[model samples]
Target: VTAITKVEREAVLVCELPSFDVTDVEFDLFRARESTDKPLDVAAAIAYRLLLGSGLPQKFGCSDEVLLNFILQCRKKYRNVPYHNFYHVVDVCQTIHTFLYRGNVYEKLTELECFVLLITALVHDLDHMGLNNSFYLKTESPLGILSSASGNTSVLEVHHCNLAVEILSDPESDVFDGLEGAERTLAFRSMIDCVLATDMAKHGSALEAFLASAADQSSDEAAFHRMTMEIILKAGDISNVTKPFDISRQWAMAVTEEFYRQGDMEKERGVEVLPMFDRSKNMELAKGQIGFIDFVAAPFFQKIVDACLQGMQWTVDRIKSNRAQWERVLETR
Candidate 1:
């Protein structure tokens, strides 16, 4: 692992934009990138600003130096892909920040849990390489073989956690380094659990489990906290569909492009591909986005906001507005 240097830290620090309040729900990362030639540095700076702005790291005894180092280390791990790159994780971190502070979901979690969730966002999709876990297993890739042997099919999540662990092993970059004893243990455990739960394969079970726990007045206290963290991170993972029309559309395009690239690779390797990924099929982005909003994002935000995170009702509202906008596009066809 290449440790973050002073020059790298300075590069990120200089990307300051006073106009952007990254904590805002409508914060446009695309606009932020367009404002700077060094998009990578600007993205890293956004994460740094969001994390530091939350005031979580400092409360946990994590120094600015260590936090910057951790952010840079994570930045290095991310590849230049259409989606699931450094920008994606920074977006998640920012979105989750809004969930915690703006949506008042922070009331459901302890200070430390909240801190871990923000940090977990950055590591959740580390080194994604634009391919889903299915690609690895379908191709019987080396990592897939290792995953099968371990009985955990969440290949990318597992890889991300492995790298996260590696980063924290160094005190210089470990934001959790300030934590000690059981607090330290909890930080690592909670961060990994949130990361692993991000696998869409486990989405249904995880959502149902969280809902059940949320309904119970006397559910295992720790279990409820853990599940809340899981669900919030999961929400942030799919939060693009809940953004404004243009922002959501831009995110959809990036993911579609990435999926097409993966599909192209799958075709080259003689593996089966889905219609959505088949670039030759020329599917409409409007239809794809509306499908996601209806089948996934809308229901998720609605249920979570109704069940416990009423403060987050804005997400549901935006999803509805965005869905309507997409339908308008479809009607124009």
Candidate 2:
């Protein structure tokens, strides 16, 4: 009763993302998901395996029971949304793992720090209901009203943090239960900071600060490390453009569909809808994705690579490659 059932454990242990190599630079988790019948369980397995595979949980005194329980709890919290669901978080977890281990960014952080990053990715979008913060605000929903009064504009980010803490409250699921003092505090703080940084409202500020930290000759080690974690999570959040062309296209479709649904809601509520979200406009997916890459994804990845994350320069390359493909989409226009 205190832990996950044997059936669930078996499900986690047996599930796998086919051909997924943590070391492979070109390994596509989005494509890998299509190879499995039990993608949800596969996602749990991916998170669990990444943690265990890193040898971090063992070093930090986390037990298999607690880890599985944590994964189950995370899986339970994620709603069935097109983009910000369990799958997106799981993708972020896997992507961050690649950034840390495969990209050589792990050298800059401690085992505990890397551990927290992966866990944060899995829980960062916990309980997301397929709606962005703007949706809540535009509708003047109860949560939106509260967020306005609290002076915290990152409404969903705050909500996600609260849920993360709630999940970690139980002894059976608290991944940090073994740590004491400073290590535990750093883990919680880093995770929450990284989660909050994923909010697009602060994207420009967060990226600017991280780049500035990289440029500062006298930036303190602690501050540098913290910013690095935050930047990595942000990079992972919008990493679709840095994936293979097909994978990036797949994600764009999912997110675009989600946006169209939100637009439908806006119409129902008599609110203004952006052209991209308005299904009546019949926005071309290719043009929308190309615009995102040109203005957002390409610049962000390229700048971060130039600033520090040289090991992850491949992201910039991939973004360019994806952009070329999207450009080809416009050829038939």
Candidate 3:
């Protein structure tokens, strides 16, 4: 677990840039890495800097040490999953941060909105149960009951947000360290809303709407910003593609292996393994990956800068290459 051992004069370093996320839990494995980028402690410090720079009061209600401890505790509690693991949180945070595009509030989003997006990326999957919503739905798990009872992803997000809220509400939740009541509450609410919005199942219509609008605009600034945010978040959600080819392949392998493990469990229980996430004898990994990128990725980023941009062109080419490689590896002989 990510246990804390020191608590001397806790200094808060404010992030110069805006950010969004509910809580910045630093996972244990990250702590083990402890490098600037990989270190959970450092990430927490960076998060504080970012939060404080977003207008948190100098007398921030929480101590850097206490807040850092709280983040570590949450990290220990949440653990990891195939998809919404701690690394994924960090990845999403980095993605959102990278997409800030060095643009001031006057250019893109307001300071507060950027802060909200930063926190959202950090804590979007707080307290995830390590199983996809589909798993819960198919198995009739209690999660399924909770999700169905709410009738949508909002219920799931609200439930997750509650965990962060409960912690932040505590006198010692430490979430408001170095901030006053108004700033604390505002940041808390905005972070919660954005994190809740990151529910993968929640953005379909919004994504489609933006995609259509961008196409109609012929890739103007308005359209580009709208579409870019979607792509940023979407890429972060499935960041395996952005890593070095070997690292990305490693991620893919682990995912496929997890599918097989889940299938084995289902088989033991006499329940037929579901497709896609399932990995039975007839599993088709390459085909599934292709379908995911084509149907999901392609349509999501369907528009380009009048078919002249090189960045998206590179992305398109990379996807094509990856798909071809996967096709060559298909075991469906």
| Better structure of 1 and 3 per TM-score | 1
Candidate 1 Cα outliers beyond 4 Å, as residue runs: none
TM-score between candidate 3 and the true structure: 0.66
lDDT of 1 at 163: 95
The candidate 2 region of ten consecutive residues with least summed lDDT is 22-31
Candidate 2, 93-206: lDDT as tens digits: 888988998789998898899999989998899888878899999999999999999999898999999999998888889999999899999999999999999999899999
Instruction: Estimate, for each residue in 1-333, the C-alpha lDDT of model 3 and write its tens digit.
Output: 324445411422332223433232222223323444434445555555444545432344445555555555445545555645565565566545544532221135545445446555666677775555556666776777887877764545676677666665555444554456776666676666455545677668656555566456455763454344444555456645533445556556667766766676666666657675465456665676777777765544344322222234444555666767777777445
> Over the full model, what C-alpha lDDT does candidate 2 score relative to the true structure?
0.87
Write down the lDDT that model 1 would get: 0.92
Give lDDT tens digits, candidate 1, residues 221-290.
Answer: 9999999999999999999988888998899999999999999999999999999989999998988888
Evaluated with lDDT, which candidate comes out highest? 1
Error of 3 at 93 (Å): 1.1
Clashes counted in candidate 3 amount to 24
TM-score of each: 0.99, 0.96, 0.66
Compare the candidates by TM-score and give the number of the best one: 1
